[PDB]
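#dry-run=false #mode=assembly
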Amino acid sequence: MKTVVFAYHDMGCLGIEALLAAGYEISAIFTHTDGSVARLAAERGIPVYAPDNVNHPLWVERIAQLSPDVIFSFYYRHLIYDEILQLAPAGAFNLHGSLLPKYRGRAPLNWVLVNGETETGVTLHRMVKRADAGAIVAQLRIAIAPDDIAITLHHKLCHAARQLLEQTLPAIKHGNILEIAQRENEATCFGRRTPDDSFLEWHKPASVLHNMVRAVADPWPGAFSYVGNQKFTVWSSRVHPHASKAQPGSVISVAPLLIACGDGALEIVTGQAGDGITMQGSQLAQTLGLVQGSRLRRTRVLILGVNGFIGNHLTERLLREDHYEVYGLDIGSDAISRFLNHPHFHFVEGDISIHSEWIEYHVKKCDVVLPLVAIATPIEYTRNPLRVFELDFEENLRIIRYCVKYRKRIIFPSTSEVYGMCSDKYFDEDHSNLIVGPVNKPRWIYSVSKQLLDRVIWAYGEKEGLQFTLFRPFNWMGPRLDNLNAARIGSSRAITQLILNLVEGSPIKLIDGGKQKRCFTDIRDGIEALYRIIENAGNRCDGEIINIGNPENEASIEELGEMLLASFEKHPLRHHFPPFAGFRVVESSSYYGKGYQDVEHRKPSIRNAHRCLDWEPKIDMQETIDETLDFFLRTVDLT
Amino acid sequence: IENAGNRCDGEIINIGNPENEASIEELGEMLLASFEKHPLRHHFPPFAGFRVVESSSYYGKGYQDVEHRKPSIRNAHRCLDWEPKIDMQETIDETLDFFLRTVDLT
Ligand SMILES: O=C(O)[C@H]1O[C@H](OP(=O)(O)OP(=O)(O)OC[C@H]2O[C@@H](n3ccc(=O)[nH]c3=O)[C@H](O)[C@@H]2O)[C@H](O)[C@@H](O)[C@@H]1O
Ligand SMILES: Nc1ncnc2c1ncn2[C@@H]1O[C@H](COP(=O)(O)OP(=O)(O)OP(=O)(O)O)[C@@H](O)[C@H]1O
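#status=ok
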């Protein structure tokens, strides 16, 4: 047949050779920079390439040009995806280093040693949308010797693969292959191991620890531990069922260097202190200062604009956990006064444009900064564009810079408005284009400002190591989303403005028909997701942009007005307010002034949220409507 | 700058020749054609040819581009009574000549 190969490292060479010996014609080989696959390719006169992303249109089109019958993947590191895979009529097969569906993850060579398996093997399966799930075309078992280590098991596997391909490859050349599907309810998956995963925890059994040192023995990074401040690596181990009433982690002897484990002791045969040379355990013991003795505050969150809608709710949330200390500054304090007595809450009434000593000192002193000061009520974009620009953009750019100056993590609040009039069904943080209108449509000044800030934060991240996370709220609402008073000037979001209407007995106006829709998110859902981001479990939020909204609560403004009215009519306090003045369609210009333009639909992709936070919106819209309505109605003084 | 009749106040004006639309590939050909006919041609090495490349390998990660760009020159006509005149090929020649005579030959 005619094929295009994706190979790298050892398996890559033996695979390209088996492929050649089997009579295949290799049109091209895709590999990586740094047995060299490239060297082999060059030696055999096979055009070799090493782009960063072969999934790029140009490559896909060029691979399609070669018109391959089948595609093979022998330890290719980057990920080849569907688009190109299906360019081969005979299919695409990948050679995985484990007994699938077991250890279908990555680094199976090491994991099988970590978990101390008795056997492993090689598997040639078909490539499908799911990683390592495709139908198995051939497999082959391998026995793991009690004294095998990563490198030695690697050759075992290489040899096994050389044999598996040797015989099952001629089979594919023709078509005698059985797609024995994978027993999905038996598949095990593992992820990339970082050198921090080879840490030795002496409380575990000597056996477990021993397999660890084997799993990552040279040429791998190795298993390590600490002698006080000093870090050392264990290259050779040796389990001793020889008990020792000694507590785990304590040195039983220095010749041999025997450490007491949770079960039995482990003998460090060879290792090295720090980046020094390898030496026998007895010597390593001395160079580390060992004798018979044992081996191996809360988070400050700064919230600017803490009294705001997002601010006060986030404070309540954080103040529930004990590992948080909350520092906040704001112009107002009615929403956070209830926390003033809390020991872990430190509030101060200030202005981001005036109180520099406090702000700078705290960005310097805290661990995470949440710059929530802003003006986010659309009427203000057209009415006071410059005030919006100066506060939303300039004032914040200053905080962003304090953060890079003092190397602090910044969880900056982006906005769903950054997508503008995007046309995708789902506004995607990593793929959607951003669309705004002409310069003569000033409503977008906000959108554009927030986007430039997102881009600056991104550059700082890329070019200066700033640790960040951008989050984009999608029409969050609930109690304290603005206030009826600000609403009297149009300075508030829809929901809270329509409540003022029902309260004062004025009609609910639906700007341009009110057919445009949005995805309303309950503030409780939003704060939970945000809380998760602050938690930043596993650092899965670094450099990430995360939308937060409930795609399930999509509704037109007209529907929002109806749902609100329905609740309002059933409310206990209803009789206190005037009779409904009705819904009335109005030209946007008559409410927002010249220069207004809007978004016809807004629904978020919440994939990233699911991936980084394991978050999912839960509260349904109607409930949010009730909560919000109730809060504001009981804000009205009745006398 | 003249702002005759203040017809440019508060105006945004595109300035381009919608008549000179061309792909970069065509720009490269037109340039090459002129280059081959140029008096100074013999001073420079033989053409190494055209080669398609991934944007990433030239601009780095994070590059994206514009597939087409043509301006409306209504405002220009209305506020300035202006209309592009020079054709692209002439601009190519001018530019090529200038830069070729920028090269020190010795
Ligand atoms: O939280 C959100 O995701 C976004 O909310 C607002 O922007 P937007 O949703 O466009 O505007 P709202 O004031 O919340 O109202 C939505 C739409 O309802 C309509 N509306 C509003 C008020 C009213 O009385 N009548 C009416 O028909 C308007 O067309 C308005 O654009 C903010 O401007 C954004 O910064 C924020 O990201
Ligand atoms: N100059 C300023 N100095 C300090 N705080 C300010 C200043 N200007 C505005 N603020 C504060 O910013 C806070 C946050 O704004 P607000 O609550 O109106 O919206 P938000 O919660 O960010 O809304 P969304 O989440 O919908 O964008 C306000 O409570 C206000 O006190």
